[PDB]
Design a protein around this ligand. Sequence first.
Ligand SMILES: CC1(C)C(=O)N(c2ccc(S(=O)(=O)C(F)(F)F)cc2)C(=O)N1Cc1ccnc2[nH]ccc12
Ligand code: NI
Ligand SMILES: [Zn+2]
Length: 275
Amino acid sequence: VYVPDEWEVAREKITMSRELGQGSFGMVYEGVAKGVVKDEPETRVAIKTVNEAASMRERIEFLNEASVMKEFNCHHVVRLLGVVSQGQPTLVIMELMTRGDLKSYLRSLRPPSLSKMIQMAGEIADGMAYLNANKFVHRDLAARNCMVAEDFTVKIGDFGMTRDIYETDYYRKGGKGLLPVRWMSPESLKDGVFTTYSDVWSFGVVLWEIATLAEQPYQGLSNEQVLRFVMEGGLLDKPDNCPDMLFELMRMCWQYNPKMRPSFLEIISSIKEEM
Ligand SMILES: CC1(C)C(=O)N(c2ccc(S(=O)(=O)C(F)(F)F)cc2)C(=O)N1Cc1ccnc2[nH]ccc12
Ligand code: NI
Ligand SMILES: [Zn+2]
């Protein structure tokens, strides 16, 4: 089961406003929470819900997925603030990222400086180095799962695979689970091997998204064509107008042998040696 703890928040302290989109287990909303941040009477929050229909099994899956976040203390990972495990619906509340997901934000820009692009890259790498140091492999790192604050700071999040807006980013390979095949490493595509090294592959696709303002990777290829192209050692082209430094960083992340890719710590160092 799930054992309630000091992260429990009384439900009456939480107010919902408009919806943010369909999560893995239910609708996600924007809202306000009383008594969750020190020196702060009201806090704007994201509220993740479980469908009333969902099984007690799936409720416990949702809670135990949020319990991973209790261990986190990184300002580049979206922060847990509370859990509502008592009564229906089951909620978890987090810090609200007012500008939404990075894919949406990049689409909205449709000429960033190397400076702004490398700053975002470094913010993402900060949160991914932290997660990978805490034995967390994200498996769906992509601009659509990065989140943008009021101040334009980027943080790692996860909105799951079920939002209608990003239906084209997922393939039900063999009719089974949805897979983000255009962001997946060769070894993830071939053998279902997901590692810190496959997160670094996906990071290189996020850099390509930054540099294209979130074009579709491998536009023109079907999902089956992407599988073959990437597993046979094919790569995304250098984006139009791409700075040398950003494309070089992408190429490092796309080494076919996962042991040849930089770690996120090495990415942060090489971004700090430009600054
Ligand atoms: C769906 C929801 C609320 C959520 O649950 N998460 C989430 C955050 C962190 C993790 S985590 O395990 O720490 C990580 F990052 F994967 F390592 C998991 C899920 C989100 O990002 N979300 C979107 C979201 C959050 C805040 N403000 C927003 N504004 C617009 C969407 C939005
Ligand atoms: Ni920072
Ligand atoms: Zn399940």
